[PDB]
Amino acid sequence: AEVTPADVAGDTALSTISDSAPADEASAPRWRAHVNAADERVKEMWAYSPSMDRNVPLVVITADESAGPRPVIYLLNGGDGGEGAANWVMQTDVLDFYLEKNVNVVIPMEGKFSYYTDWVEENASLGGKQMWETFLVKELPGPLEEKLNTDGQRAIAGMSMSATTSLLFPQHFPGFYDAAASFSGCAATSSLLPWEYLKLTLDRGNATPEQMWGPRGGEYNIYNDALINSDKLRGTELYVSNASGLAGEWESVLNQQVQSIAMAETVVTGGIIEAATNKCTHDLKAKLDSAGIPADWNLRPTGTHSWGWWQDDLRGSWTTFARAFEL
Ligand SMILES: OC[C@H]1O[C@H](O[C@H]2O[C@H](CO)[C@@H](O)[C@H](O)[C@H]2O)[C@H](O)[C@@H](O)[C@@H]1O
Ligand SMILES: *[C@@H](O)[C@H](CCCCC)[C@H](O)CCCCC
Ligand SMILES: [Cl-]
Ligand SMILES: [Cl-]
Ligand SMILES: [Cl-]
Ligand SMILES: [Cl-]
């Protein structure tokens, strides 16, 4: 990319990267065993965020030295944030897949129910002050890309809640990202229905969308509406997809009365989630097509599980990334 970390960081106090977890860590994260069993190129790093006063864990797939400096992909988890079991590391072969591609991949393992944005208000249930856009865009790239010896190219990818984030970041900082991948989300956030979809994610973290982006339709909410500001994506290589499934983000790939009742619910909820995302994606495509902004589209049918589609999204988005990075 032509825009450097220092170009977007400006005044911002930068992150400090450590190769070891804080000594005050009480218990080992669930994902640590997965890192420890993967190739030596998969590393656990920790980035201190000055704005949040938080140590953020990162699962990093490092490139080999056979071709020198390589690009970096910032891959975001959904609502889980990497703080539970419903994430890239624990539900997909993300580590093995990218190891073979020879590319740097950085997966933050904190940020549950945050939309990876800068929140207007604090929320103790989510760690207090949330400044994930400042962290991911301004605090982290400079020191981390230096440590990884990247070639100066970068991409942002997100799924579900962070499939809004991966469209907002390149719009907020045009030219910073070479590519952006949005894996099954809703670009719109200020319209009636899209605002209510923010509540599905935020209710799980004891939060409201007003704490995050202020009043619906307000200045900051519109700034964070990726459908309204879709034209600002021009210049970025894009990959937009669908992870339509019955068993969603919560599900990994007793009596027959309760086994059939619970199964009836996933078909219904997965169906409402699929329908909601399908329209959001259709509106974005119509808006980008009308503006002459090209994207790689992976609109898929209803699958058995959403995580099966999300693992397939790592493959699908590789065509966008290989093209944007000239690999
Ligand atoms: O779709 C908009 C509404 O989404 C949430 O509520 C729905 O989902 C809950 C959990 O499955 C149900 O209990 C509830 O009946 C649904 O309406 C959100 O909590 C609402 O505020 C939104 O209007
Ligand atoms: C992620 O696809 C999804 C929210 C997408 C926005 C369109 C509805 C999430 O799984 C659904 C809510 C489950 C609780 C986190
Ligand atoms: Cl250290
Ligand atoms: Cl901490
Ligand atoms: Cl494969
Ligand atoms: Cl609070």
Residue numbers in the entry: 30 to 282, 290 to 363
Quote the study that presented this structure, word for word.
Protein mycoloylation is a newly characterized post-translational modification (PTM) specifically found in Corynebacteriales, an order of bacteria that includes numerous human pathogens. The mycolate transfer from TMM to various acceptors are known to be catalyzed by mycoloyltransferases (Myts), a family of enzymes specifically present in all members of Corynebacteriales. Porin mycoloylation is abolished in a mutant strain deleted for the gene encoding MytC, one of the six mycoloyltransferases described in C. glutamicum proving that this protein is either directly or indirectly involved in this modification.
Here, to further explore the mechanism and the specificity of protein mycoloylation, we took profit of our TMM analog library to obtain crystals from MytC trapped in its acyl-enzyme state. The protein crystallized in the very rare space group F23 and the asymmetric unit contained one copy of MytC with a solvent content of 49%. The Polder map shows that S189 Oγ atom forms an ester bond with the carbonyl of the analog. This structure will be further referred to as the MytC-acyl enzyme (MytC with catalytic S189 esterified). The meromycolic chain of the mycolate C13:0 is directed towards the exit of the active site cave, while the α-chain is more deeply buried and establishes hydrophobic interactions with residues of MytC α11 helix. The β-hydroxyl group, a determinant for PorA modification by MytC, does not establish polar interactions with MytC. In the apoform, a small helix (η3) contained between residues 270 to 280, is positioned between S189, H341 and E310, blocking the active site pocket.
